[PDB]
Amino acid sequence: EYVEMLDRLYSKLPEKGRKEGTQSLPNMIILNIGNTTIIRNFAEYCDRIRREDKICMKYLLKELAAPGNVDDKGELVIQGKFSSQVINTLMERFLKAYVECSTCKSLDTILKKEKKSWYIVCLACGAQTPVKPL
Description:
Elements: E1 31-32, E2 36-39, H1 42-49, H2 53-62, E3 76-79, H3 87-93, H4 97-100
Antiparallel strand pairs: 1-2, 2-3
Helix pairs in contact: 1-3
PDB class: translation
Keywords: translation initiation factor, archaea, AIF2beta, translation
Assembly: monomeric
């Protein structure tokens, strides 16, 4: 519950090295004002769909059958199918993990995509990247 808030290297500021921030909890809800998807808590939101920059950005291109506008009054309006679905569906398994897999005794092991350099990092699994052969 106690989300340590330092802002120092959570996202946004391209000063990568010490600290990897933290994601889950604070205002994780887009506003959709007609195909226009205005991302309020964008700093969190980017690393709620995906921390891995490239695939995160690629998803917000591929899911956009519409010309993706960037930014309004400071807050990040994008134009396409990145409006309260997608990222929020992903945070339903990410942020809402404990209820998405409703407390399976202690071990909620059915989270994130166990493929192509993504996988799940600890928590549900004893070791990060539980790829494995059959």
